[PDB]
Amino acid sequence: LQSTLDNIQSARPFDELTVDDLTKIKPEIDAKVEEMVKKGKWDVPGYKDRFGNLNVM
Amino acid sequence: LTTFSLYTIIVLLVITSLYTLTNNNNKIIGSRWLISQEAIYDTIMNMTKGQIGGKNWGLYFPMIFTLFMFIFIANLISMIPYSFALSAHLVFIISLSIVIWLGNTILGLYKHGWVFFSLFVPAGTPLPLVPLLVIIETLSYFARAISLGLRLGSNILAGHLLMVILAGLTFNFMLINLFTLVFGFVPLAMILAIMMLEFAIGIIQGYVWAILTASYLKDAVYLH
Amino acid sequence: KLQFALPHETLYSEVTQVNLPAKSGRIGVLANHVPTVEQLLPGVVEVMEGSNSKKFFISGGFATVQPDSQLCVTAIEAPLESFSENIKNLLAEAKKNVSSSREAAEAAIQVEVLENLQSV
Amino acid sequence: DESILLLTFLGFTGLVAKYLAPAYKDFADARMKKVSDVLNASRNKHVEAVKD
Amino acid sequence: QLVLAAKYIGAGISTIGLLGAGIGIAIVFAALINGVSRNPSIKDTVFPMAILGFALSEATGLFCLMVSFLLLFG
Amino acid sequence: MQLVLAAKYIGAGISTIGLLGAGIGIAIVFAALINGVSRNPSIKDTVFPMAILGFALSEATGLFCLMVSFLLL
Amino acid sequence: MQLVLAAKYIGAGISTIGLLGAGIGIAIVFAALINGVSRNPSIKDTVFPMAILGFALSEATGLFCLMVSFLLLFG
Amino acid sequence: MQLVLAAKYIGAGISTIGLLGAGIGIAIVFAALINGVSRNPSIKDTVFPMAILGFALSEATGLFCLMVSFLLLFG
Amino acid sequence: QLVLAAKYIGAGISTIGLLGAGIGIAIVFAALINGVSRNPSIKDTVFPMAILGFALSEATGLFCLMVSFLLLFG
Amino acid sequence: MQLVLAAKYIGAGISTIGLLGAGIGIAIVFAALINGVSRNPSIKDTVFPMAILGFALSEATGLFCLMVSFLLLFG
Amino acid sequence: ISYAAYLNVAAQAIRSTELQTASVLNRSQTDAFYTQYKNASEPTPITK
Amino acid sequence: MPQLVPFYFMNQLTYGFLLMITLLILFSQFFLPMILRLYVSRLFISKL
Amino acid sequence: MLKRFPTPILKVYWPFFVAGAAVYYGMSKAADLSSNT
């Protein structure tokens, strides 16, 4: 826990770090993306509840 | 290659640049420019989930998105002062409308059999007008075929042609006596306003197409 | 037959014409009037029974012509002559109150009262 | 004829640089900020959890 | 050649009939938005009724359009 | 010949104008339906027969215009 | 001929009259939208799509008139 | 020739009638703006851009009609 | 001459376009009067908007008039 | 020549149709005044400047039309 | 603000020209502190 | 018909349908999942 | 990102594509018919 605390402190990405790098550190990204494309759903639930939707309706 | 072909290539390259290097570094927060096409993404997500929501909604989301984006880019690019109007070749727009209409009819027949024509039997009504409401529903069903195309075509064509006619007129307005050079700003200002309006009706048509052919697709995917 | 009443005292709870200020503008009730419910706004009310006229200043309430042609007017408190400058000074203070701010609504109501007063 | 259209387009770009480009700057900034703030907030949150 | 001249004129006159149906379509849809704002929750029942009215109002205009085509094409 | 056949074509065009009234008419009944139904809710089942009757009658005036058009065609 | 080319030009003019009914129509739908939105407030998320639908179809009848004008004039 | 030249002038005139409908259209939108703001006292921040949208669509039909008027008049 | 006749007749026909603006303006002012009589104090915001609406309605009429003059003078 | 004079007197008739719009319009402004006053008589003085303004503006469109009419008839 | 609260404030203001009775004034002056009661418990006795 | 009666209709329509198929594929396979990646990446940070 | 991700657009959009082919052929014949006008 000391090491993890230090790792978040010594490298905190919150602006940039490639989203490709986020795919590289987590293939969970591609798993979900592929599953969503396979599902044919482009709504991401959770995205909307803490990032707004721009809408004209 | 034709003039039309050359400008279709130009449109394609414009659309490519809007994602290829609109996102610099593939940043988590993403470049500010891509925020625009994010908002477009969200308002078409919530529109076609709003319309053709259901299990197949996102299965028709790329199609409804390139139906936004084609018309959205092609009624901005065509509004450039020296740029060739693809959309003023009506045959591409009207053909796309007939294609989608036929592709609704084929989909409807495929998805809902010979009871596809039960889409054109609307609801219970007294028996002497049960057949009537099939005849002048089917009449309206292939009025849907041409209506979607003819809206977009008429507006865009009329805007460019109106603008050019007034532009040519103000040219000859400024070739008469010098008193017209003084206070010749009011017709110039009309042309500026018309050019401003044409971007607006092009974005309005780009959204209205992709929602109206979501409404027809709503009918086709879910009978009633 | 008018029933005009306040919790404090009844007023008329015969009367020929009653003129009332309502959220539906101004309503006048004369003989048979179709049976209505009206929110009474802060108001100046005139009651005429025959040609004799009595003038009431009314703090809003509810008005209801009943389907038996009984004009129930109920309001918190009232005569016009009784209400009838120092209040204008108070209302000026109330404008000051709007600056800081339920107090906001109160001060707004004070402005409404200033209008109602101005009507006098 | 068409030089009139180029003058109007130039005028349009003048109106855009006056009005739309700062408005869109403010809009874009607002969203950018909101996203960024959410991200840094989650990072802060997560540092807390380690300590907890 | 009077017939040919008349064919083009007659087509124009036929176009006039359509305007009324256009107004009609708006009248139904105005009621839809008005109604929905009035009830709130009526909308799911009312929307089918509305679409029916739209189609019927539209159809009158379609008849006018067909007469235009019948003169024009012959 | 030319003039009489021409005149038929002209008369036919004019006849469409009569139809416009029906176009507005059908809508007015339906508008009332949506407004009425949103106001009551529950009236709808009784009212829907009345509405069909009103549709038919409005349409009927248009039919008279339409058949005159067909005669001229 | 002179008569035929004239008849096309005149006939086109007559066709243009048809647009007026749709023009008023479009405004009525947008009015209903503004009216509804001011009455409810919150309805707007549903009601704005409904209004867009009503706009499109009202517009289309006028445009049919316009297309006949174009057909005669251009053709 | 004379008949064709005449037909240009006449055709323009007939087309000018259609503009009247758009005039009424704009007025209806603004009437609704006024009415709505009067209903709510405070709808306006939403309703003003909404009204401008309504204005633009109602106006557009008139402008299409005006184009046809110019096409007939000028050629 | 037929061309001379045509410009005078055509000028007449174009004048009809003004009609719509005349109805239109009155509806804007009617709504202003109805609104202000309901609110009282709405007027400070609303009166500017009413003048904007008046101007736009009139502007359409000026297009009609400009066509009328293009026929009449031209 | 006879054609010109004929066209003048016919043309005079045609323009006069435009006046009808203003005739309805004046009534609409006054109707609003009457309704406003009846719905609240205390507002009346604030409304009164706007009322005279609206009457004039309504009438004016008809007068634009009327000037064209006189240009044909007298001119 | 509550509609009847709106009417109330107006009534209190309306007793202000003045000639008024003590009983009116008493009727226009509150004398209470509402004790909100949690679930047993009780948030503060805010002056009503 | 300022270019609305060519004989080049099929030329136009051929290049037209080619552009549609290109954009459809292009959006769908490339660029749409690049937006969906942004959503999912943001949600993964949100979850993390 | 700009990786080719498989999308099932080849059987979902099959009725659209069938319509595209039909109009393509019909326009070939139409173009030949219009070039004699």
Instruction: Determine, for residues I53 and H34 on separate chains, whether the beta-carbon distance falls below 8 Å.
Output: yes
Half-sphere exposure of I57 (CA within 13 A, CB side): 31
Q: Where are the domains of chain H?
A: 2-75
**∠ Cα K12 K16 K22 (to 5°):** 80
Backbone φ/ψ region at C97: left (φ over 0), alpha (ψ -120 to 50), beta: alpha
Question: Which tokens go with C52?
Answer: 């004799």
L-chain residue closest to D37, CA distance:
L46
CA atoms within 13 A on the CB side of L1: 8
Residue B94 CA to residue B203 CA, distance in Å, equals: 18
B88 vs chain D: nearest CA distance in angstroms? 17
Q: Which residues of B touch M8 (CB under 8 A)?
A: 59
- Choose among I18, I61, H28, I54: nearest CA to J23: I18
**Interface size, chain A vs chain M, as Cβ–Cβ contacts under 8 Å:** 10
- If one counts every other C-beta atom within 10 angstroms of the C-beta of residue H46, the result is 16
**For residue E52, what are its two tokens?**
């029916």
Q: Quote the CA–CA distance of B13 and B2 in Å, as a whole number.
A: 17
Is B123 in Cβ contact with E55 (below 8 Å)?
no
For F2-73, CATH gives 1.20.20.10
Nearest to H60 by CA among H31, H37, H35, H29: H29
- Classify domain I1-74 at the CATH superfamily level: F1F0 ATP synthase subunit C (1.20.20.10)
Query: CB of G30 within 8 A of CB of B117?
Result: no
Identify residue H71 by its one-letter amino acid code. L
Judge contact between B4 and L15, C-beta under 8 A: yes
The dihedral sign for the CA sequence A30, A31, A36, A39: positive
CA B17 – CA B23 distance, rounded (Å): 10
Name the pairing type of β-strands K45-47 and K33-35.
Answer: antiparallel
* Total residues found in chain H within this entry: 75
C114 touches K: beta carbon within 8 Å? no
CA J7 to chain centroid: 25
Of L11, L13, L23, the CB nearest to B15: L23
* CATH architecture, range H2-75: Up-down Bundle (1.20)
Q: Where does F1-73 have alpha helices with state H?
A: 2-39, 44-72
Nearest alpha carbon to residue G51 among A22, F47, B204: B204
User: How far apart, in whole angstroms, are the C-alpha atoms of residue E1 and residue H8?
Assistant: 21
Q: Tell me which chain G residue has its CA closest to the CA of residue L1.
A: G74
CA max distance for chain G: 62
**Beta-carbon separation of J39 and C119 below 8 A:** no
- CB distance G66 to E52 below 8 Å: no
Count CA atoms within 13 Å of residue B46 on its CB side. 17
Give just the sign of the alpha carbon dihedral B163, B164, B167, B168. negative
Neighbors of chain J with 3 or more C-beta pairs under 8 Å: C, I
**Residue H16 near residue I19 (C-beta atoms within 8 A):** no
Specify the number of domains making up chain L. Answer: 1
Of I16, I22, I72, the CB nearest to J58: I22
Q: Tell me the residues of D at the B interface, defined by beta carbons under 8 Å apart.
A: 1-9, 11-12, 15, 24, 28-29, 31-32, 35-36, 39
Q: Residue E24's Cα: distance from chain center in Å? A: 7
**How far apart are alpha carbons H18 and H27 in whole angstroms?**
15
Task: Extract the tokens encoding F7.
Answer: 């005149």
Residue of M nearest to B57 (CA): M12
Longest CA span, chain C: 49
Given CB atoms, is C82 within the 8 Å cutoff of chain K? yes
For residues H10 and I7, the answer to whether their CB atoms sit within 8 Å is no
Q: What is the 3-state secondary structure (H, E, C) of J28-60?
A: HHHHHHHHHHHHCCCCHHHHHHHHHHHHHHHHH
Cα gap E33→E23, rounded to integer Å: 16
Amino acid at I61: G
G49, A56: Cβ pair inside 8 Å? no
Annotated resolution, angstroms: 4.5
Radius of gyration of chain G (CA): 18
Which residues, 6 or more positions from C50, have their beta carbon under 8 angstroms from its beta carbon? C16
Residue B137 forms contact with E (CB below 8 Å): yes
Say yes or no for a CB contact (<8 Å) between L7 and M31: yes
Token pair in block for residue H11: 């055709």
For B129, other C-beta atoms within 10 Å of its C-beta total: 14
Taking one residue from B and the other from H, the number of pairs with CB-CB distance under 8 angstroms is: 33
Phi-psi region of E4 (alpha: psi -120 to 50; beta: other; left: phi over 0): alpha
Nearest to B8 among L19, L26, L45 (CB): L19
Beta carbons within 10 angstroms of residue J35's beta carbon: 15
Q: How far off is chain B from E10, nearest CA to CA, in Å? A: 22
Q: What is the 3-state secondary structure (H, E, C) of chain B?
A: CCHHHHHHHHHHHHHHHHHHCCCCCCCCCCCCCHHHHHHHHHHHHHHHCCCCCCCCCHHHHHHHHHHHHHHHHCCCHHHCCCCCCCCCCHHHHHHHHHHHHHHHHHHHHHHHHHHHHHHHCCCCCCHHHCCHHHHHHHHHHCCHHHHHHHHHHHHHHHHHHHHHHHHHHHHHHCCCCHHHCCCCHHHHHHHHHHHHHHHHHHHHHHHHHHHHHHHHHHHHHCCC
Touching F: E residues 1-30, CB under 8 Å: 1-3, 5-7, 9-28, 30
Block residue for tokens 């901005």: B76
List the structure tokens of H62: 């008139």
**Could you tell me if C62 and C35 lie in one domain?**
yes
Measured N-to-C along each axis, helices B90-112 and M14-34 cross at an angle, to the nearest 10 degrees, of: 140
Q: How far apart are the first and last CA of chain B?
A: 45
| Residue C2 and residue C73 in contact, taking contact as beta carbons nearer than 8 Å | yes
Its sign, for the CA torsion E67, E68, E74, F5, is: positive
When CB atoms are compared, the residue of B11, B37, B91 closest to L12 is: B91
Does C112 touch chain J if contact means CB atoms closer than 8 Å?
A: no
Q: Tell me, yes or no, if B219 comes closer than 8 A to chain E by beta carbon.
A: no
The helix (run of H) or strand (run of E) holding residue M31 is helix M14-34
- A-chain CB neighbours of L31 within 8 Å are none
Helices of type H across chain C:
80-83, 86-100, 103-119
Residues in chain H with CB shorter than 8 Å from the CB of I43 are none
Using the Cα atoms of residue G64, residue G66, residue G68 and residue G71 in order, give the sign of their dihedral: negative
Report CA-CA distances (Å) from C24 to C20, J40, J48, K4, L43: 10, 9, 21, 18, 52
Count the Cβ atoms, other than its own, within 10 Å of residue C113.
23
CA–CA distances in Å: residue B105 to residues B41, B218, H65: 28, 12, 34
Neighboring chain A residues of G44 at a CB cutoff of 8 Å = 57
Q: Which residues lie closer than 8 Å to F60 by C-beta, 6 or more apart?
A: none
Contacts of I63 in chain H (CB under 8 A): 19, 62, 66
Distance CA H16, CA H10 (A): 10
Residue to mutate among L4, L9, L15, L32, with most M CBs inside 10 A, is: L9
E11, β-bridge pairs = none
A:G CB pairs within 8 Å: 7
Q: Range of L12's domain?
A: 1-48
- Tell how many helices (H) and how many strands (E) occur in chain H: 3, 0
Of G49, G52, G63, the CB nearest to B151: G63
| Residue from the list K10, K16, K19 with its beta carbon closest to the beta carbon of C42 | K10
Residue for token pair 């060519």 = L6
User: Which one of G48, G63, G65, G67 would you mutate to disrupt binding with B, by most B Cβ within 10 Å of its Cβ?
Assistant: G63
Among F residues 4-63, those touching chain B with beta carbons less than 8 Å apart: 49, 52, 56
Decide: J50 and I32 in contact? Cβ < 8 Å: yes
Q: Is C70 helix (H, G, I), strand (E, B) or coil?
A: coil
Find the discontinuities in chain M where C to next N exceeds 2.5 angstroms and give the residue preceding each.
none
Cα-based angle K15, K18, K20 (whole degrees, multiple of 5): 65
Report F:46-65 residues touching E (Cβ under 8 A). 48, 55, 59, 62
Cβ <8 Å between B151 and G59: yes
CB contact under 8 Å between G23 and H22, yes or no, is yes
Residue ranges of E strands in chain H = none
From chain B, the residues in CB contact with A53 under 8 A are 42-43, 45-46
Question: How do beta strands C2-5 and C17-22 pair?
Answer: unpaired
Q: Do residues F69 and E17 make contact, with C-beta atoms less than 8 angstroms apart?
A: no
Contacts of B224 in chain E (CB under 8 A): 48
- Please give the residue range of the domain that contains residue C98: 87-119
- Contact between residue B193 and residue B111 where contact means Cβ atoms under 8 Å apart: no
> And the tokens for D12?
């349009």
Interface contact flag, A18 B25, Cβ < 8 Å: yes
User: CA D50 from chain center: how many Å?
Assistant: 34
Contact criterion met (CB < 8 Å) for A34 and M1: no
CA angle C2, C3, C5 (to 5 degrees): 140
Tokens of J20: 């009808």
Residue in this structure with the two tokens 């209040």, named with its chain if needed: C87
Residues of chain L neighbouring B69 (CB-CB closer than 8 A): 23, 27
Using CA atoms, how far residue L31 sits from B19, B27, C65, C82, D35, in Å, is: 7, 15, 67, 77, 21
Residue A19 and residue L37: Cα distance in Å, rounded?
8
| CA distance, residue I73 to nearest chain H CA (Å) | 12
Contact at CB, I10 and H9, closer than 8 angstroms: yes
